[PDB]
Amino acid sequence: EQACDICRLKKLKCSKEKPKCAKCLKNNWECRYSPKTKRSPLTRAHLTEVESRLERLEQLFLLIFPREDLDMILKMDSLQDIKALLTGL
């Protein structure tokens, strides 16, 4: 049922046999069944919890930045830089 890391990336049918499978035995390959990777729950209640948090921060930032491209700031990645910027408060 779970396919192997590689068959997964290569997208071919997996034989699925453990410990090494079809191809991964053949091409003498590093065959892993990596564990099931978590996501946050897609439920309505959780969408809504997260939308309520986002609204409140969104509101708090309308007052910090009444003037624009908050989105400019939101895209930056550098900490010094962002902080150099803000010290134009």
Partner DNA sequence: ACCGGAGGACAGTCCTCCCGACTGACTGACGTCGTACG
Partner DNA sequence: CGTACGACGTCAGTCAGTCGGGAGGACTGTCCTCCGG
Known binding residues for Zn(2+): 4, 7, 14, 21, 24, 31
Report cis status (omega within 30 of 0) of the bond before 19. yes
> Is residue 51 a contact point for its own copies (CB under 8 A)?
yes
5: left (phi over 0), alpha (psi -120 to 50) or beta: alpha
Instruction: Show the site string, 70-89: x = touches its own copies by CB under 8 A, - = not.
Output: ---xxxxx-x--xx-xx---
> Is residue 80 a contact point for DNA (CB under 7 A)?
no
Exposed (0-12), middle (13-18) or buried (19+): which is 32, by Cβ within 10 Å? middle
Which positions touch its own copies (CB under 8 A)?
39-40, 42-44, 46-47, 50-51, 53-54, 56-61, 63-64, 73-77, 79, 82-83, 85-86
